[PDB]
From a paper:
Poxvirus encoded M2 protein is a member of the poxvirus immune evasion family and plays roles in host immunomodulation via the regulation of innate immune response mediated by the NF-κB pathway and adaptive immune response mediated by B7 ligands. Here we reveal that MPXV M2, co-existing as a hexamer and a heptamer, recognizes human B7.1 and B7.2 (hB7.1/2) with high avidities. The binding of oligomeric MPXV M2 interrupts the interactions of hB7.1/2 with CD28 and CTLA4 and subverts T cell activation mediated by B7.1/2 costimulatory signals. Cryo-EM structures of M2 in complex with hB7.1/2 show that M2 binds to the shallow concave face of hB7.1/2 and displays sterically competition with CD28 and CTLA4 for the binding to hB7.1/2.
Interestingly, two oligomeric states, hexamer and heptamer, were revealed in both cryo-EM samples, which were also observed in 2D class averages of M2 alone. We finally determined three complex structures, M2-hB7.1 hexamer, M2-hB7.2 hexamer, and M2-hB7.2 heptamer, at an overall resolution of 3.04, 2.7, and 3.12 Å, respectively. Unexpectedly, the cryo-EM analysis shows that M2 displays as hexamers and heptamers and binds to hB7.1/2 with both 6:6 and 7:7 stoichiometries. The resulting structures reveal that M2 forms an oligomeric ring structure with B7 proteins binding to the outer face of the M2 ring in a 1:1 stoichiometry. Despite the different oligomeric conformations, the overall structure of each M2 subunit and inter-subunit interactions from hexamer and heptamer structures are virtually identical. The root-mean-square deviation (r.m.s.d) is ~0.4 Å for all Cα atoms of M2 subunits of two oligomeric structures. The subtle differences arise from connecting loops that appear more dynamic owing to fewer protein-protein interactions. We found that the oligomeric M2 proteins can engage into hB7.1/2 with higher avidities than the monovalent interactions of M2 with hB7.1/2.
Numbering used by the authors:
A (entry chain D), C (entry chain C): 20 to 220
B (entry chain K), D (entry chain J): 27 to 132
The structure:
């Protein structure tokens, strides 16, 4: 017996909180615009992929060697020009850490060629590497918390849907990079934050 | 998770394995509260106190051989969990390499 | 790493105040007509270009050797038959002065052949030249303040947009020409002025 | 930017480099207040007072060798910045060639 990924459907009623991306930008976004984010999902050859167009950025984030496909994403703008991204897949059918590759390109403001391309380790358990690459100089900092233990309280889940998140510390992963001379500051203020669910898929 | 004992002196270890075996001379080693206030800062082996919050000002110590923060004169308020964050400073970009979360009960 | 111009989009949410054109006319325009100005933009071979049809004039203004494209323009009519033009590009990715070429043709009143074709220097820093040419005798005076430090207060920016302007004196440029025996008088009265955003692009 | 001193006599220089080395005989040299009132006027070497505002009437002097306006009997009101504008008169059209902005604090 082998657990397999469920067949693709039009609407997914069961969501798994997989990632918590708080990419910062040095240009101003004032507030969360309803209906701004556009998400395109893919699952080809056991590799999940999500492309997020919104708030001046394209996020092509892919996970290697998984039985999960990205089914949802919610994007919000916090204070000090912070872009929080919440990602949801189907279900966790394995208890192993997965390799992550994220491409962050600027479609507005500081557009340009690749400024950064590196492997960001797990902060905890040191078991995987994030291939980050940034097409632009418009990103202040990147924070990706894979399989978080806590959902952001300002995100209101839909009524007909179901949400599951990780409850064990052993499956948490943290990747972070800063390009400015401040400790952390990838983390948000979470005092006045609102989330918008991306359009397609 | 690692906890500490009562109101004498709290030990907060990062427990870095240092698998690549890099030196502390280019390493940013620092601690932080659950309400996300910086405890101590090490930039390149020198403590910096500008980002340290005033409630923890002049009340913490650092030991480099044991990689441990010593937290003196414990109070009743600081019962939350404390996390230590280890970044690797590179001129291309500052990479977070290690984080760990410990607890504190007095 | 090289900063590049952002890819073209349908609507541009980030605007950079690049120029302040106050072309005067000897015929009467009483007030700013809503929906009068029509703007056509171009970026071919690193040269920005804008064609402004409105209030009896066509303004074919182009900038050489830039990483900016004209994304917006606002036109207004002040007192004493003054035509203020505000121009907005994407962003300033270089700290050098750019060569400017402006063609002002009269489509109403004093239409005719080229009366003027010259190089107007920078008034400040003497670092660039404006190739001006005027197809008509209907222009009193031309004033072009490239990268101004102050926005005109009577121009009301749209709510969902963002505006950035120059803050350094070193990037200011001034070009001016008068064809009548009055000192200055290219500058407006700015007591009762209203602006209209041009239609296309 | 260039400033001037207290209530004795203010010096307002244009500081024209004159790179093409043209003569003052065909040059329009004049000064103006921040509220956009003309201070002095030179048309072809002769001062013209018709466009000069009445508040600055008969109270300014011009020096051609040093290209400087001397502003006598300073008051408390005139603390704003003053800009000097240099046009090149041609029968085809009058071309502004030089402008500069200076300050005045008394």
């Amino acid at each position: 017996y082998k657990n397999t990924i469920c067949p693709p459907r039009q609407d997914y009623r069961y969501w798994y909180f997989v990632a918590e991306l708080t990419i910062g930008v040095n240009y101003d976004i004032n507030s969360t615009i309803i209906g701004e984010c556009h998400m395109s999902e893919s699952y080809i050859d056991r590799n999940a992929n999500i492309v997020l167009t919104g708030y001046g950025l394209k996020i092509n984030m892919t996970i290697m060697d998984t039985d999960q496909r990205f089914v949802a994403a919610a994007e919000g703008v916090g204070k000090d020009n912070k872009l929080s991204v919440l990602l949801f897949t189907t279900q966790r059918l394995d208890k192993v850490h997965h390799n992550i590759s994220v491409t962050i390109t600027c479609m507005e403001m500081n557009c340009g060629t690749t400024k950064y391309n590196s492997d960001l380790p797990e902060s905890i358990h040191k078991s995987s590497s994030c291939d980050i690459t940034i097409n632009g100089s418009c990103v202040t900092c990147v924070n990706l918390e894979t399989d978080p233990t806590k959902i952001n309280p300002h995100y209101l889940h839909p009524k007909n849907k179901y949400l599951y998140h990780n409850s064990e510390y052993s499956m948490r992963g943290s990747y972070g990079v800063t390009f400015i001379d401040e400790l952390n500051q990838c983390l948000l203020d979470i005092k006045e934050l609102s989330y918008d669910i991306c359009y397609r898929e | 998770k690692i906890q500490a004992y009562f109101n004498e002196t709290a030990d907060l270890p990062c427990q870095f394995a240092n698998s690549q075996n890099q030196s502390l001379s280019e390493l940013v080693v620092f601690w932080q509260d659950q309400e996300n206030l910086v405890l101590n800062e090490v930039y390149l082996g020198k403590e910096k106190f500008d980002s340290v919050h005033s409630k923890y000002m002049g009340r913490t110590s650092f030991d480099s051989d044991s990689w441990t923060l010593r937290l003196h004169n414990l109070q009743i308020k600081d019962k939350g969990l404390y996390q230590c964050i280890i970044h690797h400073k590179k001129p291309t970009g500052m990479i977070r390499i290690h984080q760990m979360n410990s607890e504190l009960s007095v």
